[PDB]
């Protein structure tokens, strides 16, 4: 019954900074550390980090040791992914993720994800053009 | 005797956009294409054979629906001839 | 750092049969505790990671006897016996040895089916957008299979190598196949210089690549 639910969509663009929630269900929120995963569009499954929930000492993987960084409520058991100076390649989908007191890891509760798109593009509705059959 | 028409769908942000054909009574032959970015906005495509002989006769035009703009904007195909 | 690898990018089968999807590792991977943390997820469409077997060989809570983990150092093999209609998907190792835990590669687990060749049709751009300016000449290369197929514009005799932007189906749900549309964006200037518009389809059921075209 252990959920790990998570934020919605988020349309940001270069520069703007994103903070990003996991809420964690039925557990001792505090007794397992969260971990965060990146999937670009379209496979690209790369791992972010973890922050230790006792201590919220974070722990980044070599390339996610610049804009990013973990955060949490105790009072909510909420973990938090947030990105800064906010790049074009940050467009991905981000997952949060936890063990089962395995020392060795186990990524076995996952949440939904929360996809976050970075473009300069303001909303902007499609212009339409019928595609008849010319030859 | 097939006749596959079509429908730009392009210069949109954000996503989604639904493109029906024939108010969705058109669910053959019908592919809607993966959005990409022709820069920094979407573009996709749709595509639907349809018989020969009903197409010219009338009634098929194409349904894109843009939840963020909140637009509904569809287009029926004309020959253009020449 | 352990680069996994996995093997095949694409796996297709028919249903009912035995799939066999093998991971690499770059190092050994048993830490320290003393076992090998050899993991594979199963992703659907829009979907999170379902972890399938675990430590190698340990099935999870739930998946199937079916998926069966195999392995030994660096080499580690998962395999599947009776294929469901709920299978396919895209599978990937994973490790929790080391740091950083690295993600296989991904083998996309599709159905597979008699080959066929492809609807090829060509539209020039419309009235509307020629007035915006833009020109846009389609290609729907429709119901192919398999996927691989390649599509060359060519302008007035001479290949045009840049302007397009291509853009896949997947797997078509109600048959199998693949479609795939080709687009080419000059300006309206550009477009205006030319006479000739051609679309090669080239897909492995011919020699003689399909072609349909347009002048103005």
């Known amino acids: 019954q252990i959920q790990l639910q998570q934020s919605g969509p988020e349309l940001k663009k270069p520069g703007e900074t994103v903070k990003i929630s996991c809420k964690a269900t039925?557990?001792?929120?505090?007794?397992?550390?969260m971990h965060w995963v990146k999937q670009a569009p379209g496979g690209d499954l790369k791992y972010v980090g973890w922050?230790?929930?006792?201590?919220?000492?974070?722990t980044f993987a070599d390339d996610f040791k610049g804009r990013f960084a973990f955060s949490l409520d105790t009072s909510t058991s909420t973990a938090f992914l947030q990105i800064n100076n906010l790049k074009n390649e940050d467009t991905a989908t981000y997952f949060c993720?936890?063990?089962?007191?395995?020392?060795?890891?186990?990524?076995?509760?996952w949440g939904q994800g929360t996809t976050v798109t970075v473009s300069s593009a303001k909303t902007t509705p499609p212009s339409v053009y019928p595609l008849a059959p010319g030859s | 005797s097939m006749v596959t028409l079509g429908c730009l769908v392009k210069g949109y942000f954000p996503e989604p956009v639904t493109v029906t054909w024939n108010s969705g009574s058109l669910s053959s032959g019908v592919h809607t294409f993966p959005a990409v970015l022709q820069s920094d906005l979407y573009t996709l495509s749709s595509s639907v054979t349809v018989p020969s002989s009903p197409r010219p006769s009338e009634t098929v035009t194409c349904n894109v629906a843009h939840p963020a703009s909140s637009t509904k904007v569809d287009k029926k195909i004309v020959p253009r001839d020449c | 750092d352990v680069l996994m690898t996995q093997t095949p990018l694409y796996l297709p089968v028919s249903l009912g049969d035995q799939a066999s999807i093998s991971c690499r590792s770059s190092?050994?991977?048993?830490?320290?505790?003393?076992?090998?943390?050899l993991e594979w997820y199963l992703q659907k469409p829009g979907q999170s990671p379902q972890l399938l077997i675990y430590?190698?060989?340990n099935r999870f809570s739930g998946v199937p006897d079916r998926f069966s983990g195999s392995g030994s150092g660096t080499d580690f093999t998962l395999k599947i016996s009776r294929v469901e209609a709920e299978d396919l998907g895209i599978y990937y190792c994973?490790?929790?040895?080391?740091?950083?835990?690295?993600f296989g590669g991904g083998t996309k687990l599709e159905i597979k089916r008699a080959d066929a060749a492809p609807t090829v049709s060509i539209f020039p751009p419309s009235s509307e957008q020629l007035t915006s300016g833009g020109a846009s000449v389609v290609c729907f290369l429709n119901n192919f299979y398999p996927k691989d197929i390649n599509v060359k514009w060519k302008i007035d005799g001479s290949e045009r190598q840049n302007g397009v932007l291509n853009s896949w189906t997947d797997q078509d749900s109600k048959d199998s196949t693949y479609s795939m549309s080709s687009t080419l964006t000059l300006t309206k200037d550009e477009y205006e210089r030319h006479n000739s518009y051609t679309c090669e389809a080239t897909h492995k059921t011919s020699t003689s690549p399909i072609v349909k075209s347009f002048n103005r």
């Open positions: 993720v936890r063990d089962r007191h395995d020392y060795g890891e186990i990524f076995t509760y």
């Open positions: 039925n557990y001792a929120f505090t007794d397992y550390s």
């Open positions: 922050i230790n929930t006792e201590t919220d000492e974070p």
């Open positions: 190092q050994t991977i048993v830490h320290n505790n003393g076992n090998t943390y």
């Open positions: 430590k190698v060989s």
């Open positions: 994973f490790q929790g040895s080391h740091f950083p835990p690295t």
